[PDB]
Design an enzyme around this catalytic site. Sequence first.
Site, PDB file in Angstrom:
ATOM      1  N   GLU A 298      -8.755  95.470-100.696  1.00 16.24           N
ATOM      2  CA  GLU A 298      -8.838  94.106-100.177  1.00 16.24           C
ATOM      3  C   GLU A 298     -10.144  93.468-100.637  1.00 16.24           C
ATOM      4  O   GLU A 298     -11.197  94.114-100.636  1.00 16.24           O
ATOM      5  CB  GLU A 298      -8.743  94.088 -98.630  1.00 16.24           C
ATOM      6  CG  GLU A 298      -7.306  93.850 -98.047  1.00 16.24           C
ATOM      7  CD  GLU A 298      -7.230  93.701 -96.507  1.00 16.24           C
ATOM      8  OE1 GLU A 298      -8.172  94.124 -95.790  1.00 16.24           O
ATOM      9  OE2 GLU A 298      -6.207  93.157 -96.021  1.00 16.24           O
TER      10      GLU A 298
ATOM     11  N   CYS B  69      -8.881  63.666-104.104  1.00 16.10           N
ATOM     12  CA  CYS B  69      -8.642  63.299-105.487  1.00 16.10           C
ATOM     13  C   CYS B  69      -7.472  62.320-105.615  1.00 16.10           C
ATOM     14  O   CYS B  69      -6.759  61.990-104.657  1.00 16.10           O
ATOM     15  CB  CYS B  69      -8.351  64.540-106.329  1.00 16.10           C
ATOM     16  SG  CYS B  69      -6.629  65.141-106.109  1.00 16.10           S
TER      17      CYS B  69
ATOM     18  N   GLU C 275      -5.509  90.360-100.036  1.00 14.52           N
ATOM     19  CA  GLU C 275      -5.373  90.633 -98.603  1.00 14.52           C
ATOM     20  C   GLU C 275      -4.085  91.380 -98.315  1.00 14.52           C
ATOM     21  O   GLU C 275      -2.998  90.938 -98.718  1.00 14.52           O
ATOM     22  CB  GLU C 275      -5.377  89.384 -97.726  1.00 14.52           C
ATOM     23  CG  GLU C 275      -5.568  89.748 -96.248  1.00 14.52           C
ATOM     24  CD  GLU C 275      -5.295  88.599 -95.278  1.00 14.52           C
ATOM     25  OE1 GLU C 275      -4.432  87.750 -95.612  1.00 14.52           O
ATOM     26  OE2 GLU C 275      -5.930  88.564 -94.179  1.00 14.52           O
TER      27      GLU C 275
ATOM     28  N   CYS D 240      -8.057  69.994-103.051  1.00  8.40           N
ATOM     29  CA  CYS D 240      -8.803  69.557-101.848  1.00  8.40           C
ATOM     30  C   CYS D 240      -8.756  70.592-100.700  1.00  8.40           C
ATOM     31  O   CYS D 240      -9.275  71.682-100.904  1.00  8.40           O
ATOM     32  CB  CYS D 240      -8.333  68.152-101.515  1.00  8.40           C
ATOM     33  SG  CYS D 240      -7.863  67.255-103.020  1.00  8.40           S
TER      34      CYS D 240
ATOM     35  N   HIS E 234      -6.159  65.194 -99.086  1.00  4.66           N
ATOM     36  CA  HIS E 234      -6.586  65.011-100.466  1.00  4.66           C
ATOM     37  C   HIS E 234      -7.766  64.051-100.564  1.00  4.66           C
ATOM     38  O   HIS E 234      -7.804  63.018 -99.881  1.00  4.66           O
ATOM     39  CB  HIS E 234      -5.448  64.473-101.318  1.00  4.66           C
ATOM     40  CG  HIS E 234      -4.522  65.532-101.799  1.00  4.66           C
ATOM     41  ND1 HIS E 234      -4.862  66.404-102.809  1.00  4.66           N
ATOM     42  CD2 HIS E 234      -3.263  65.858-101.423  1.00  4.66           C
ATOM     43  CE1 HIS E 234      -3.857  67.231-103.027  1.00  4.66           C
ATOM     44  NE2 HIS E 234      -2.871  66.917-102.205  1.00  4.66           N
TER      45      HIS E 234
HETATM   46 ZN   LIG Z   1      -6.502  67.015-104.249  1.00  3.63          ZN
END
Ligand SMILES: [Zn+2]
Length: 311
Positions: free
Chosen positions: A167, A244, A172, A279, A242
């Site tokens: 891990e 962007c 994971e 994001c 977001h």
């Molecule tokens: Zn984004």
Amino acid sequence: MSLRIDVDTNFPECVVDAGKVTLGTQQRQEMDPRLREKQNEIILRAVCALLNSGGGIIKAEIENKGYNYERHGVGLDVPPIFRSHLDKMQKENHFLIFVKSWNTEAGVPLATLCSNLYHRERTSTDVMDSQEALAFLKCRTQTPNVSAAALFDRKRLQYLEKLNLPESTHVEFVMFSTDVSHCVKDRLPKCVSAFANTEGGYVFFGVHDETCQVIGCEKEKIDLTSLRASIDGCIKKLPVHHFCTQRPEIKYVLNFLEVHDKGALRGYVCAIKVEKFCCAVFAKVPSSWQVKDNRVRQLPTREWTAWMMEA
Ligand SMILES: [Zn+2]
């Protein structure tokens, strides 16, 4: 999420009605464990409510007869930075909490019970407290492991086979509950959120962690045709915000690694690959509350993020 807690802003300061409540350290510890939880939530939602609405008072109606304050304790689990705002006090069979306006304590513009913004550092997936998440949101507001990926497109595995691969921040290992869907339907979003927010990675479902051993699940208590549906319905349900222009989806990849033992086709490992993300990806909606029109109402993810960036 959940229950409706009624408040009425008559006169001056508003008053959130937590209703019936058991109190004290000891006798909240001998409560119905699934009601020491139920109550303690309505408090934390109303404390957070008024933290983000200039201040208030929470009226509570005591359950356990003959509560004594300086002698039974308060017995309420309250976030630490919240307490610098909390004057508690009694009155007969009734109990009051005074909540002072949050007033941007810690430079974080608002009080948040839980961000649901996860990130996996080193070998461990945590949520970010509103301290942590404020910085990661400030830091993603700007625009621009090989072994692991060999294992991700294996096609067979061997029961109890101890894999080479520990891990890490990209790997994971998580183990199936008795219900496969209602495990993966719950454990997943934390993982997806974590990996998206922190350099992307692999969740291997049905692998013991402390020993990196394959395990699996009975090849009959899961159904690969629907578990991909419900998995894809779960990830496209994840709230994301977001910064962007591009504005993608979460790019991810799901493979079913067959376990075997004695050439016998028994079992399954569920693998999901989550690619870094543009994001931010929340596992559910930020638990964070205001007093809007005579109910405590939850803050929606577009507002919670905006609210945090007035800073
Ligand atoms: Zn984004």
